[PDB]
Amino acid sequence: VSLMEKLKWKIKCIENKFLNYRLTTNETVVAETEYGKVKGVKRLTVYDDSYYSFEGIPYAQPPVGELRFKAPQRPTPWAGVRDCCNHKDKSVQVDFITGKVCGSEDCLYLSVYTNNLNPETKRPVLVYIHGGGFIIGENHRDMYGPDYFIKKDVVLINIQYRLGALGFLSLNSEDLNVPGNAGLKDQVMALRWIKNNCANFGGNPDNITVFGESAGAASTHYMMLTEQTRGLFHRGILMSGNAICPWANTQCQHRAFTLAKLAGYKGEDNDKDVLEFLMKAKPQDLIKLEEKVLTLEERTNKVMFPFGPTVEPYQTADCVLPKHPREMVKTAWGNSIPTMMGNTSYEGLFFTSILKQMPLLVKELETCVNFVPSELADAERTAPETLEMGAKIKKAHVTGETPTADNFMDLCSHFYFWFPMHRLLQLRFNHTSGTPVYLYRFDFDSEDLINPYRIMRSGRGVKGVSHTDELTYFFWNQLAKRMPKESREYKTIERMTGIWTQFATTGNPYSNEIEGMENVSWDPIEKSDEVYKCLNISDELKMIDVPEMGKIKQWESMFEKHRDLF
């Protein structure tokens, strides 16, 4: 991020401090939890609404010392009142604006918001799992403010979970009890807390919806796949991602050794001696080196992150992912709850700044071998079958005689988002009770209201609807402002939170109380459909055939000889 955007951000951090004070009221309130009483507080919004706020509710023991890299343990209870009028630390990470390491190992918290702690009827409970590649993110209100959703009569809960190597280290040796996925295990313990405790805040434990964007959508989907969570919740919403995405899962068992070596370890490639070294390292020292861990070959093969969700090398009682996601879909409990999925209209537009920076990436489209699904390719990407599959992808995305940045971005929309969604829809239809899945396509562009991922990405002034742009219409953030009621942006806030609340309530996203829906016939996708229908959300709401369908089917065609892998 540029100096000018860094200054502008610092100014916004200070203004947000002042605003937050102005919007804090003096109406403190106490709620019960299974581990002790919590004190929260009423806050106002810039729209002059109000909500009860409890932040910093622990759902697990701080995963420090000997609990580092291990599955979470339940927190210790308390006999008095715990102060929850302020946020806790985020998980250790690199701050994207500043570039410096920030956060704490002491990060296993969730926050609970609602406009009314004693409603006459128990309310639908919406649980947001944040994205950020499993390496960044938080539940702080300067990023994920509940100010729009508290216009609706819901309970909203935003969780944290461990990030990076501290959340996703994985070792083969069973003696060591570091199988992987500690951060997903965190999410499991948070969802158990929510089911056990949401009643204390006016939530219906029999009507919980989990939703997330990007890594939070992959997370939502993992929570729908694992047996650990069977029946814990009742709707899911996957916003630009799922567990079949190529970035959502990695076998990272050798990368602990690599990270240790970067941190100054000398010794053998031996899980015990490697874990021992990493157990004494300063957490910030490990997070700072994480960006250096992937090899050139891995980055070329499109491995996005060194640590993340993984298939666990052995079983334990707390095992979240015992098989590859596609195998887990075959027996998944969550195939049988109402689900909504969708993507933006130009997902890969996110990579604009990356292509400016590294313009030789566009030369990858000359053969497209690097984008062939890894299960079909070779690591060297030189086999003739790999070249033939790459030629198919190239037909789908290269529109003229020389590959362009736009073509690269288009291909990215499909490789990282639309293709895995198609794979997941088709696999799930084979293994479901028949509960509906609905599709949206977010296609609303504005520069009048933005979110911090636009600064991260250097996307100011870039026309089109990038990955992450929909977050602006769900959550308040410190770059936001009060929008006039008549504005296109306000109307889109109303619509998006309306639709999500409607879905959370009923399992059907359609409502004629939502403005612009009077001619919308939003039907779920069927097995028999050759062409997906979606609600395209722009200035109007319109059911259309997914514009991306053609390319989706071209990607599918790479599996003609290997239909069992599709």
Other beta carbons within 10 angstroms of residue 404's beta carbon come to 15
CATH class of residue range 1-566: alpha beta
The DSSP letter of residue 445 is -
CA 416 – CA 248 distance, rounded (Å): 9
Contact residues for 294 (Cβ-Cβ < 8 A; gap 6+): 303, 305, 306
Q: Which of the following is catalytic: 53, 91, 111, 214? A: 214
Spatial CA neighbour of 393 closest among 417, 366, 420: 366
CA 310 – CA 312 distance, rounded (Å): 6
Contact residues for 557 (Cβ-Cβ < 8 A; gap 6+): 392
Amino acid at 323: K
SS3 562: coil
Does residue 562 carry a catalytic annotation? no
SS3 219: helix
Contact residues for 210 (Cβ-Cβ < 8 A; gap 6+): 127, 129, 191, 220, 223, 224, 233, 235, 236, 237
User: In 330-412, which ranges are E strands?
Assistant: 339-344
How was this structure determined? It was done by: X-ray
Contact between 90 and 102 (Cβ < 8 Å): yes
Q: Where are the domains of the chain?
A: 1-566
Q: Which of the following is catalytic: 467, 470, 494, 548? A: 467
- For the range 21-26, what are the long-range contacts, defined as Cβ-Cβ under 8 Å and sequence gap of 24 or more? 24/85, 25/50
The whole-angstrom distance between residue 54's C-alpha and the CA centroid of its chain comes to 22
Burial of 26 (0-12, 13-18, 19+ CB in 10 A): exposed
Give how far Cα 306 sits from Cα of 290, 517, 523, Å: 7, 43, 39
CA 124 – CA 208 distance, rounded (Å): 6
Contact between 28 and 41 (Cβ < 8 Å): yes
Structure tokens at 236: 């899911």
CA 93 – CA 36 distance, rounded (Å): 30
Give how far Cα 516 sits from Cα of 91, 482, 488, Å: 40, 22, 12
Structure tokens at 407: 């073509």
Other beta carbons within 10 angstroms of residue 454's beta carbon come to 21
φ, ψ of residue 237 to 5 degrees: the values are -130, 120
Other beta carbons within 10 angstroms of residue 47's beta carbon come to 16
> In the chain, what is the greatest distance between 2 CA atoms, to the nearest angstrom?
71
Other beta carbons within 10 angstroms of residue 459's beta carbon come to 21
Other beta carbons within 10 angstroms of residue 480's beta carbon come to 20
Does residue 214 carry a catalytic annotation? yes
Residues facing residue 41 across a β-bridge = 28, 53
Cα–Cα–Cα angle for 276, 280, 286, nearest 5°? 100
Q: What is the dihedral of CA 547, 551, 554, 556, to 10 degrees?
A: -80
Contact between 347 and 453 (Cβ < 8 Å): no
Residues facing residue 50 across a β-bridge = 44
The DSSP letter of residue 538 is S
Spatial CA neighbour of 121 closest among 511, 505, 510, 508: 505
- H/E element holding 260? helix 255-262
